[PDB]
C-alpha cells in the first residue's frame, strides 16, 4: 500500500514519481513514553500493523535447469514428468502430472519443485527447495529452445513470492535520515490516546533531535497535520521561506484556524494508568518509508555442522550453517581478561 | 470510603445516542476504573470476523495473502452471543461445528461485454462483474443454522467495501470460516471504531474581564464556550463541554494572568463508536459485565503454593 | 495498491468511500476539503487515507495475460 506524501516538493509532479510510491503517511508522536525507544529505536502500534502498515513482499526467481553438463551433442538424458516405477506419492500433493509445481502452492524447505524422471538411472528423481524461508509459487514459465528441436522442455523458470511482514528489527526511516530499528510492537490499549481518540502509529524519541539537528522533521509534522485537516497539499521546496516568513508562523496559522494548538501540541492521556500526562505533546503526520535489510536476512546460529576439509574448522556461511569468527582482536581481549580457559 | 459513599455520588448522564456512536458522561468515578472500561471495549469484548480463507481458485492480479487479509477486516452483522467459542485444542475432526463457525463464499468471473458503447471508459459498462464488492459474499448455512439465523442473515455491516478488481479471463473463488475472537489477539475482532474519554475542561477566570477586551477574550475559544452577559459586561462560562482545549489564550500576553486552565479529574466524557456488529450501548454493558466476571472468576480459584 | 479497508490508526471502516469520493470530486466538482467531511471523516487519522491514496491497481490491470490484446 503505497501513498503519496502530503508535504511534497514541486518536482514530485513534474518528474512523475507518484507512479512509484515509496512510503506511508504515518501519524508520529514525539514522546519518550515506553522506555523501549531510546538510542535510535522506534515503536510501532501493533493494531496499526495488523491492519497492514508497511506490508511488503519479496519476489525471487530460480531457474530449474538440466540442459547443463550435457557435452554438446548427447541425447536428452533426463526428462521432465513422472515415471512408471514406485515414487512416494506425496510428491503428487505438490507437483502436477508433468513434473511442474501447481501455481499457488505453499513450499517449505524440503518440498519438491520439479520431478524429473531420469532414464540412465531408471528412477523418478526430484529437485528440492533449498532456502529455509517458506515461500509460495507465483509463476512458472516453460522456456523453449531458440535453436532447433531439442524439445523435451530443458529450461523452466520458477518465481517464488515471499511474505515480509514488519517484524521487530526492521529498519524504518523518515525523509531526513532518522534511520531507526523497530524495537517493540506496542499494544494499542497501552498507547497514549489523544482527546479525539487517535492513538499514534510511530513513537519516536525526542532525544534523537538535539545531536542530529533535524529541524526539517519538526516542520514536516506541522505541515502534515495542517494539510490533512483542510485537505490541501503543502509546498516544501527549499528556499521559499526566509527570516521574516518562517514556516512555523505559517503552518501554525493554518492549525489555529482549524481549532488546534498553534504550536502543534495535543493534550494526550496515558494508556497504562489512564491519567493525563504532564505536558501537551507533539504529534503530526510524517511521511515515512520502509527500508530493506530485514532481520530475517541477518541472523545465524550454529551448533555443529559442515566443516572445512583441510583444517577441520567450520565454513564461511549463513547459507551453509557456518560459524562466526574469533579473530585476532577477540583473541587479545580474552587474554586481557585473564581468562585462559575461555581462550582454550 | 464505602460503596454507599460511591452509590450516592456516582452519576451517569447520557448526552446523545445513535446506532453508530454514543456520547455519555461519567461523573464521580476514579480514573483507575474509568480507564478499566476503556481497555476492555477495545481489547476484550468478542466479535466475529473471518479467520481462515480457503482458496479454490484465484487468477486475479491481487495476490492471495493480501486478498485473504482484506476479507478479514470486514465487520459482519452477526450477534456474537449467537455463536460459541472455538476450541483450539482439537484437530479438524472436532474443531468446526455448526455452533462455532459461519461459512461465507465468494464466486465471481469477469468477461467482456459486447454491448460496449465505442470509446467508453468506465468498467461498470465495459466489463461484466469487474468490481468485486463486499456484498458478493454469500451466507452458507450448515446444520441447524437455517432455523437459527432465519430471522437475521449474515450481512457485512458496510457492504460497499471494495475487495478486488477484475479484467476478462479472471476469477475469484474462496470460502471463509468466521469464528469468535477478542480484540486482543488480532485487531480485526475489536468491535469499536474508537473508544476514548476526556476529562471535562475547567475554565476559571480570576479578574473580571470586560469591555472590548472581553470581546477579544471570547474569540480565543470555540463559539459557545465563553459568553458575555449583558448588564455587568463580564465574561462568563456558558459551557466548557464544548471546549476543545487548545490553549489559545496563553499566546496573548494580556490574558496570561487572568485565566488558569484545568480539568475536573473525575468527569469522564466517554465517546463510543461501533464498528458495525453491535449497538454502542450494548458494548458498554459488555465491558462492565466482563470486569465483574474477571473478578468473580478470580474469586473462586484456590490459591496454591 | 487498492484502498485499505480499515484505517490504520483508529480502525474505522474506510475502504468503501473511495468510489463515492471520486464521484463527489468529479460530478459535483468540489475541492478535496468539503468532499472528505461530507463522507464523515472528522478526524485526521482516517482522513488522510482517502485523501492521499494512489490507486495503483489501475496500472497493474492493463498487463493482463488472459486476453489477447
Amino acid at each position: 500500500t503505497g501513498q503519496t506524501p502530503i508535504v511534497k516538493a514541486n518536482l514530485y509532479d513534474d518528474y512523475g514519481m507518484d507512479n512509484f510510491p515509496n512510503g506511508f503517511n504515518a501519524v508520529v508522536a514525539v514522546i519518550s513514553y515506553t522506555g523501549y525507544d531510546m538510542d535510535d529505536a522506534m515503536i510501532i502500534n501493533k493494531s496499526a500493523d495488523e491492519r497492514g502498515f508497511g506490508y511488503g513482499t519479496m519476489y525471487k526467481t530460480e531457474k530449474v535447469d538440466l540442459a547443463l553438463n550435457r557435452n554438446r551433442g548427447d541425447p536428452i538424458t533426463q526428462h521432465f514428468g513422472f515415471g512408471n516405477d514406485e515414487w512416494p506419492k506425496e510428491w503428487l500433493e505438490k507437483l502436477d502430472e508433468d513434473g511442474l509445481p501447481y501455481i499457488g502452492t505453499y513450499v517449505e524447505e524440503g518440498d519438491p519443485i520439479c520431478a524429473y524422471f531420469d532414464d540412465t538411472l531408471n528412477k523418478t528423481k526430484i529437485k528440492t527447495y533449498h532456502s529455509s524461508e517458506p515461500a509460495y509459487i507465483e509463476e512458472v514459465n516453460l522456456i523453449g529452445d531458440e535453436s532447433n528441436k531439442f524439445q523435451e522442455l530443458q529450461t523452466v523458470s520458477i518465481k517464488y513470492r515471499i511474505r515480509r511482514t514488519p517484524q521487530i528489527g526492521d529498519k524504518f526511516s523518515s525523509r531526513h535520515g532518522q534511520k531507526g530499528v523497530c524495537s517493540r510492537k506496542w499494544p494499542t490499549i497501552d498507547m497514549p490516546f489523544s482527546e479525539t481518540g487517535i492513538q499514534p502509529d510511530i513513537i519516536i524519541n525526542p532525544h534523537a533531535f538535539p545531536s542530529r539537528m533535524t529541524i526539517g522533521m519538526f516542520v514536516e509534522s506541522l505541515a502534515g497535520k495542517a494539510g490533512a485537516l483542510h485537505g490541501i497539499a503543502q509546498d516544501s521546496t527549499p528556499w521559499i521561506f526566509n527570516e521574516d516568513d518562517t514556516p512555523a508562523d505559517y503552518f501554525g496559522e493554518q492549525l489555529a484556524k482549524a481549532g488546534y494548538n498553534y504550536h502543534g501540541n495535543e493534550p494526550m492521556y496515558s494508556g497504562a494508568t489512564g491519567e493525563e500526562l504532564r505536558a501537551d505533546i507533539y504529534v503530526g503526520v510524517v511521511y515515512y518509508q520502509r527500508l530493506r535489510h530485514m532481520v530475517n536476512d541477518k541472523f545465524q546460529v550454529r551448533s555443529t555442522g559442515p566443516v572445512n576439509s583441510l583444517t577441520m574448522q567450520p565454513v564461511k556461511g549463513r547459507k551453509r550453517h557456518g560459524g562466526i569468527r574469533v579473530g585476532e582482536m577477540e583473541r587479545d581481549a580474552l587474554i586481557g581478561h585473564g581468562t585462559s580457559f575461555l581462550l582454550q | 470510603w464505602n460503596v454507599e459513599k460511591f452509590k450516592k455520588d456516582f452519576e451517569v448522564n447520557i448526552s446523545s445516542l445513535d446506532a453508530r456512536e454514543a456520547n455519555f458522561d461519567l461523573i464521580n468515578i476514579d480514573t483507575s476504573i474509568a480507564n478499566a472500561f476503556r481497555r476492555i471495549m477495545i481489547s476484550e469484548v468478542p466479535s466475529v470476523a473471518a479467520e481462515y480463507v480457503y482458496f479454490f481458485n484465484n487468477t486475479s492480479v491481487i495476490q492471495d495473502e493480501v486478498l485473504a487479509h482484506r476479507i478479514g477486516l470486514v465487520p459482519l452483522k452477526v450477534d456474537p452471543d449467537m455463536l460459541t467459542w472455538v476450541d483450539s485444542n482439537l484437530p479438524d475432526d472436532e474443531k468446526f461445528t455448526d455452533e462455532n463457525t459461519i461459512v461465507l463464499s465468494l464466486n465471481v468471473k469477469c468477461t467482456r461485454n459486447p454491448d460496449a458503447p465505442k470509446g467508453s471508459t468506465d468498467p461498470k459498462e465495459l466489463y461484466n462483474n469487474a468490481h468485486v464488492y463486499a456484498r458478493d459474499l454469500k451466507f452458507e448455512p450448515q446444520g441447524r443454522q437455517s432455523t437459527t439465523f432465519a430471522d437475521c442473515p449474515v450481512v457485512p455491516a458496510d457492504p460497499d467495501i471494495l475487495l478486488a478488481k477484475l479484467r476478462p479471463g479472471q476469477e475469484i473463488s474462496l470460502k471463509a470460516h468466521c469464528i469468535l475472537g477478542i480484540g486482543g489477539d488480532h485487531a480485526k475482532f475489536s468491535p469499536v471504531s474508537t473508544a476514548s474519554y476526556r476529562l471535562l475542561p475547567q475554565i476559571n477566570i480570576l479578574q473580571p474581564i470586560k469591555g472590548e477586551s472581553a470581546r477579544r477574550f471570547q474569540k480565543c475559544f470555540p463559539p459557545g464556550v465563553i459568553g458575555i452577559d449583558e448588564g455587568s459586561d463580564e465574561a462568563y462560562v456558558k459551557d466548557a463541554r464544548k471546549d476543545t482545549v487548545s490553549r489559545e489564550v496563553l499566546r496573548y500576553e494580556e490574558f496570561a494572568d487572568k485565566v488558569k486552565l484545568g480539568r475536573v479529574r473525575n468527569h469522564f466524557i466517554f465517546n463510543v463508536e461501533s464498528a458495525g456488529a453491535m449497538t454502542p450501548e450494548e458494548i458498554f454493558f459488555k465491558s462492565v459485565r466482563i470486569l465483574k466476571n474477571k473478578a468473580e472468576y478470580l474469586k473462586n480459584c484456590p490459591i496454591t503454593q | 495498491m487498492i484502498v485499505p479497508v480499515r484505517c490504520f490508526s483508529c480502525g474505522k471502516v474506510v475502504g468503501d468511500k473511495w468510489e463515492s469520493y471520486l464521484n463527489l470530486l468529479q460530478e459535483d466538482e468540489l475541492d478535496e476539503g468539503t468532499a472528505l467531511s461530507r463522507l464523515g471523516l472528522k478526524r485526521y487519522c482516517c482522513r488522510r487515507m482517502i485523501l492521499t491514496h494512489v490507486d495503483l491497481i489501475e496500472k497493474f490491470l492493463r498487463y493482463n495475460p488472459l486476453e489477447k490484446r
Binding site: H230, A258, G259 | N23, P222 | -
Partner: peptide
C-alpha cells in the same frame, strides 16, 4: 520577494467529541 501566499477560505475542522459543524 513575495510571501508564500495564504491559503484562503478556511473554517473549523475540529470540534469537541460530541459536537458538530452546525452547533457553532
Amino acid at each position: 520577494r513575495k510571501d508564500v501566499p495564504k491559503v484562503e477560505g478556511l473554517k473549523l475542522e475540529h470540534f469537541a467529541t460530541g459536537y458538530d459543524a452546525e452547533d457553532f
